[PDB]
Symmetry: D3
């Protein structure tokens, strides 16, 4: 009838797994600049945790990943439909917490940044389904919304409840959020490749396909993955060998270095201001 045990089951499962906690560390780091009450910071951390959990729950069915952190995924314990149902309700649940922050403007930020996140994820899903390689500009504009969406969403809701005074620090913090969202995705791509199964594009894999327009081997191992469903170890070694010859990994290291210089410059400028 009404027990609400089949709704929060999947939500509670994913919320009891090991996690890095980068989203909460970002809030803690920002709270130094914007002095805020512990109550508000904890509310924002809960919001970020719920949004992250919903995103993780959804992005596992769309990747057919049986395991998460060595533990089984949520849809392998509850079912795909139940996981979708709980994830679509976590959006409503967060909607009641943004409304408890006592600010009419906080709902506008929520409703705009969520739309940006959904646009980015929609583009990622399209490029995954239809194997169309995007340009570097396109890929860098997706991950500034798909991954930098949560950081920007948290930042804009925190400079609004920030006590008076500091209001000028809006553009700088937003740029920091975007650069961090870019860095945290290039880093994950580099880590995953140097140390693709679901035929997912990455920054190193676009450079290879762009610099080498006549590489017919790469474009065929990229299609065997789509057709069969995944690449075995012998084919993954071939893909890594093809990427090692185009200088894609060096390109990725250069991009990461360039991004980190921007991060440190923004941090030093912000520290100078405050």
């Amino acid at each position: 009838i009404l027990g609400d045990e089949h709704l929060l089951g999947p939500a509670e499962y994913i919320s009891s797994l090991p996690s890095k906690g980068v989203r909460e560390a970002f809030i803690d780091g920002l709270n130094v600049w914007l002095v805020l009450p512990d109550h508000r910071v904890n509310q924002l951390k809960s919001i970020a945790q719920t949004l992250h959990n919903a995103s993780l729950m959804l992005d596992d069915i769309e990747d057919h990943s049986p395991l998460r952190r060595g533990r089984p995924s949520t849809h392998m314990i509850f079912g795909t439909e139940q996981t979708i149902n709980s994830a679509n309700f976590l959006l409503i649940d967060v909607m009641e917490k943004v409304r408890q922050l006592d600010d009419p403007r906080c709902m506008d930020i929520y409703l705009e940044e969520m739309r940006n996140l959904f646009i980015g994820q929609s583009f990622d899903l399209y490029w995954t389904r239809n194997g169309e390689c995007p340009s570097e500009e396109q890929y860098l504009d997706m991950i500034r919304q798909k991954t930098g969406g949560l950081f920007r969403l948290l930042t804009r809701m925190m400079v609004q409840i920030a006590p008076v005074q500091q209001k000028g620090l809006e553009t700088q913090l937003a740029s920091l959020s975007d650069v961090l969202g870019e860095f945290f995705q290039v880093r994950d791509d580099y880590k995953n490749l140097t140390e693709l199964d679901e035929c997912k594009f990455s920054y190193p894999l676009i450079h290879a396909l762009t610099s080498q327009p006549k590489n017919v081997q790469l474009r065929g191992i990229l299609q065997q993955s789509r057709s069969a469903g995944g690449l075995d170890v012998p084919l993954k070694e071939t893909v890594l060998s093809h990427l090692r010859q185009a200088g894609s990994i060096e390109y990725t290291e250069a991009k990461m270095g360039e991004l980190m210089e921007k991060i440190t410059d923004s941090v030093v400028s912000l520290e100078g201001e405050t």
Copy 2:
């Protein structure tokens, strides 16, 4: 990337299919603009529900035409449904009333609990009772009607404030009637092992019927039933006396719906 063509695609496709407009016809002296706003909210919520339900039932067709997940994929349809929820959120905001927000959130919570119970019963093959099944369809199906009626009463010019309870009861009875009718007009005209009022009566009145339970189990681990198996299921339901046990419910619900 500032495009909306891969996010709004499935939403436009599901809104182009032919419909019956039950929710719109359901929709207190209200100004016309408010009525159009409420109709848009109802339509968008129904479209999202259909988009999600077609996936959770592996239905290749909807009203004769293809389903949304066979033209755009599963994941894109899911993303579009989530953004449709966000868009309904935006639409409720424009109604210019603080108290519509709480109504929307509470009704969505109830609708999701009902759908969760339905999904649990369908996946695990656990047969609900009469009371549990009749309480699940007061939320999964009557949730939209209750949501709309509570929203309409609030933004209606004063006077009509004591009729919230009566209209809510009317909405619950209406949702029950719709679900029981759709159960009836599906056997007196299953492949995903969906329970129903006739099926529950048959399985409860007969605690030792092994044939029906075996056919249902075959349906579960086959992806669906063929024509002979569906025919024997119908014969079992007809012999158990559940086609007119359901016809008594449809009359009893019509008695309540007529009174209030």
Copy 3:
């Protein structure tokens, strides 16, 4: 037609390494019942054939690729041929009971095989439909499935036994029933401690009963049902859910109680006979201690 293709699946399973629990049980009971070597060997053949047919059928109805580490009979001869050989083995055993020179041995056979088939039918119904039985229902079933061959052999031995030893029948039947319960709870314990076919057990029943709201265990069991077996990480999660409800200790308590009953019954039998039975107690030692 020259035989073969019929007693080939039967001979493949008779050439595999075994243990000899039933044979040792017969030799342990013979010191109390006292039978000629001919009759004891005939009963050994009957028990061996019946156990082999049971294993042949169990492998098919469990989708088990291997048995004792070696390939199964139906992966070398086909499902249909194995079924045919198993059906013929029942007719073959029914030819050996007739050579025991007793009309009353046929009634015992035909009345205990019915109980065997009833217990196995309930096992199959619960496995296929996903229904979870109660502890009483589960314990009663394994008193007919696993403790039926022991009872069958026992009731045949107390009928060919020379005149006098015939009042010791109810005690021996109870001993066989408790042995059949013990041999199944032990396997249930051993498999878990060190579900691919959605098989129920004492720990799993306890976990499902004590926790009416554990939605994760009921979820992984359904995943197993809908995927033809669990993976190793899901198996570890199922096993971990069974150490938080106390199922592993509940199974050991049941095992201890069963062993106490076995020891009490053996002591009573060794007292109402006058002969200490040092071969059945070595079998008890080989089991747990």
Copy 4:
């Protein structure tokens, strides 16, 4: 203190330089808590006649120092001391070995009582003694006494195990209980044997005197295999000359053992006390053997009584009968009922036929992957495969309850033989169906005489047995009729299923097509496609029909029916 605490046991005090010219100044110890060792043999003896039977041999017991297991090895732990005396007495009496059947059951109760107590305390510690026990018993069995052997050097290593040294050795191992590595044993095996041989050779040497009398008593005895008696034929002498011969021969190689203790393990690595203590333990028993064997009754029996006198102080049936009633509710044709004596006997036979046919149909539907039967869903789609198999087996068991009420023992054998033939036929059918093997015409016709004519033969023979005595000369005629009738039914079924083989079943027309045309590759390819994919699509079926009709196989089939029909 993890060393040998020899405070509970002490050496024997004797002023002589050495008794009987053996074991000069060796530690022949005696245990002060020896009272447990005494009953150990007596408790065993009480078990024997209670399980095996009466004894007339007294055994091993002397008024002097003590038992052979007492003097030789008193270095046991206080608790694990009497369990060994139980083993020794059985071994010291086993060499000599309806009521015969009862005697055997007694043996299984002695070879398990000793095993129980020994294994109970510690199995890995225990397993050593049984492992040595297994090979020890077997070795002496193989050596035939009628066949002789060669020089004493090759003799001793047979004898060192034949009477058996490692037996006492493995109990000493059982005394202190250190597990030893596998390969390190091998290099020290030639270290222990010189001690073992000298240890073992004494036993027989003292025991020679009593072994002699036995040969004269037994005529059939071929040889008294014994080391010292081997000198009697090899080096012919009076008698006591051979007793002198080895009196110091063993004495000569034990002196070697003192070196081995002080050698490399305890030499260069003198500060390696964990290993150096291990070596010493082995050489303690040696003085023990000569003590007891000196004058004991077992070896010198003159004491007899003097030794004895001095020493006297579920409701069920719903998941079983679920697939069976479903298949019995589907429409039938009444072919076997019409084929089938007072009315009750006829009804009993009709019930038997119906149940057997239902079981056959249930089993056959599973092995055809056929979802439908008479337009109605098959049984394995309402109850599954395993439940249907269970019900099919129980139906075979149940028919037996029906057969036994016909009041005829010679109806219990007809049923079994006919079912054997039915299963043979079905086995050949299944083998040909699976392993893509086309039978010949004769093989196919033989198979369908048993798979399909088995039921008719069974019913006819049962009816002849049941029927009044006068009309019993038919039998053969009716059986031949039934065989032809079943053949006709099978050929008809093959013919009709073609005019108007989704599982690649060999029919009568198909065999003709395959045999008359050895070079037809299209038909064979289509059959293999059916085997692999699972079945045939409609144009494939039409091309199969075209290939069969071109070869004139349907006209062949119709000729068989007219031939079969004429015989009927």
Copy 5:
């Protein structure tokens, strides 16, 4: 134990099937202008028939077509591997057939034309497997080589075998053959579409995908075709409705009319510089 019975086998089942005789009729067509003897005509016709049979046998495998002319395909009676083997041997058989024409240049012609045919087929396969939409120019270039290759082969060998005199009328005949193959392919596409199961790109489909690079529905249905290895009736009707809105069935009739104008002009021109 030396019979050639499992090799020639698949090559006879495909020959037994009914045909339309386009290649034979074409061979008869250029024979009035070239006037070469009957035995040479029969040899050329046998070469063309064998090449067409090999092409059909390979094509049916590379598309999973259970049926051909209403009857089952060759790889459902002999399997895939034996069909591939027979297709590979039919090339060698055709090349034994060519040397009997008693002209060294026939071998060079044959080798060049088969190189072109294999290039065209390679591009067709790459576009089909990788889900890459060709442009109009690329598609028209491919169908000029894959489909017009056989006609060009036959006409180039015919103008070489034929009795002396007339030799300058080679380029015109090659142009005619290329245009004719283009027409055959476009006609086949139109007939199939009006009256992509294996994700095959056509002229109307290319036009629709080029005209509206925002139609996500068409692209999604084309991807569903690839994912499920085929399209059902409602999805095919939806694709046809999409093509009947972007003016793809009308942009195809103009191409066919232009190809007929070219064919008629080429025939007329090749009727003036002869007798």
Copy 6:
């Protein structure tokens, strides 16, 4: 445009590591036949291209995901593109045989290719239908399938060979057939000692012939035929059956007997020259 899709699979299979048995055999024959270097390189090109096409096709017709520890060609380019490239390779070699400046070099090519295709056809038919050939039938097949390239190369070399080389035609051809037979038996031995594609071999044919009633072996072979391959315990069971039947010793004796003929033929050829 270009041939980037037609020569893809050919170049990929050329890149992979090889042994060089064909090139070594050509070099070995050269000491008797004394061809110029240019012709020897032309023949090496022909042999390499033919071998590569053969491997490309064999991997397809045997569902082998791997080749020498590296991914197969049809796992990178698809089955259709690989078949197309193999056919173009068959075409391309015929443009190389035509560059040897001898009309008679083409009839040899056509006849030996016919023989090779016949042998492979019998192999494929036996594999698909699950029919066990006889020893004579099996040995006649491999004398054409794997003894075909050797015979082709030998005949072309003797045809190009500068004058003389009269009697060195039949002896060298017999050497080629024996050598191909020995290579196939050696490969069968190696595969066995250190079945997934239901492939018959000398040990397996011997076992199924010496034992007319071994039902277990036939059942395991049918299970391999149906399921798609043998998992490890079933492969161990087949190996145990073969060891019990004595097939391994039969194979080793056959290998020794073939090597004796190889040695005698080589000694005789050296003796004549």
